[PDB]
Amino acid sequence: ATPVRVGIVGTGYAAQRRAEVFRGDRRSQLVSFWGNSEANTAKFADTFGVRPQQSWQALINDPEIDLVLIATINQLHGAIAEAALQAGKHVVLEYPLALTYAMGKKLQQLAREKGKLLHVEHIELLGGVHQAIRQNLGKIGEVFYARYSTIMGQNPAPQRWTYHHQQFGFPLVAALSRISRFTDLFGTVQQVDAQCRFWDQPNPEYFRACLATAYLQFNNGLKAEVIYGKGEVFHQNERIFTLHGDRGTLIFVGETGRLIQGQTETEITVGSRRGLFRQDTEAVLDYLTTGKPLYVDLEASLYALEVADLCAQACGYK
C-alpha cells in the first residue's frame, strides 16, 4: 500500500543508508525514527528532517507506520522484531535477527502467521567485500583454508553498548554471519572449536577488551579461522579476509582485494555498500507494492544464527 510509511529503529550506518533510499524513492515515506543516544539522535533528525520518537515501543505501535527498519543495539533486535510483528508491521533488520535460533524461528513463524514481511540482510559489515568474494570464488577451485580476522585497538574502551556484555552479546555473532553465507559452496559447518576471553572494566558489566576465536571445519573440507578482537590490549589492528583455494588465493585487506593465481595478481573491484543497500531497499519496496518475491530468504540469516549458537556453546558463553 503506497506510500510505504517507514519507522527506523536506529541511527547508525545501516539506518542512514536505508533512510536515504526510503526518502528518495517515491513509493515510500520516512515518518519516524528512534535512537539510543542523545547526540546521534539529534544528528539523524537534522539530516533527515524527521522527528524522533521517545521510545521504540511507541514507534512500532504508531498506526501511521507500515514498515519497521531495525538497525540498533545488538541485544534489542529480536525483541523489537517480535513487538513490531505483533503490532502488524513489516520488519526489515540489519543482522542480527535474534539472540537464539529458537527466537529466530519464533519470529519466522510469527511473521508468517501475521502475513507480514520479515527480511534480514547483513550489508553494513563488509557487504561489498562479500559480493566481491562471491563473484570470484569460482576462480580459485576447491577452497581449503580461509582466515577472517578483525582486530580493532581502542584505548580507552568506552562505556557504551558495544563494550557492554549483555547489550553487545556474543562477540563473534557478526563475524560468524560473514563466514556462514557461502554454504552454497563450502557446505555446512561440521566441527567447531571456539574460545572467548574478556578483560573486564572495574564495572564488570563492561569489558575493556575481548578476544574471541573460532576454528571451523566445513563439510566440503574447508578449515576456517574466525577472529574477533577489540579493546585496550590490542596494539596492531587487522582487517583481513583471506581464502586459499587450489587454483588461487583471494586476499581482502579492508575493502581492498586481490586475486592471486600462479604468478599473476589481479585487482578486485569492490562495490559500495550504499549500492547494495539501495538495491535491497528497492527490492523490499518491490515486494510490498507489487508482491514480487525477494531473492533473499530468511534461511541464510537463520543458519548464521545456528552457527553463532554452536560457537557460543563451544565457548561456554552465556
Author numbering: 8 to 325
What does the paper say about this structure?
In this study, we used a cyanobacterial BVR from Synechocystis sp. PCC 6803 (Syn BVR)13 as a target for the structural analyses.
We determined the crystal structure of Syn BVR by the single isomorphous replacement method coupled with anomalous scattering method using an Au-derivative crystal. The structure of apo-Syn BVR was refined at 2.1 Å resolution to R and Rfree values of 0.200 and 0.239, respectively. The asymmetric unit contains two BVR molecules. Therefore, these residues were not included in the model. The overall topology of Syn BVR is nearly the same as those of the rat and human homologues, with two minor differences: Syn BVR has an additional short α-helix (α2) in the N-terminal domain, and has three additional β-strands in the C-terminal domain. Comparisons between the apo-form and the NADP+-bound form revealed small but significant structural rearrangements upon NADP+ binding: the N-terminal domain shifted ∼1.0 Å in order to expand the active site, and the loop between β5 and a part of helix α6 (residues 129–135) moved ∼2.0 Å away from the nicotinamide ring of the bound NADP+. Because of the steric hindrance configuration of the corresponding site in the apo-form would not able to bind NADP+; accordingly, these movements reflect an ‘induced fit' type of structural change. In the apo-form, the guanidine group of Arg185 in helix α8 formed a hydrogen bond with the carbonyl oxygen of His129 in the loop.
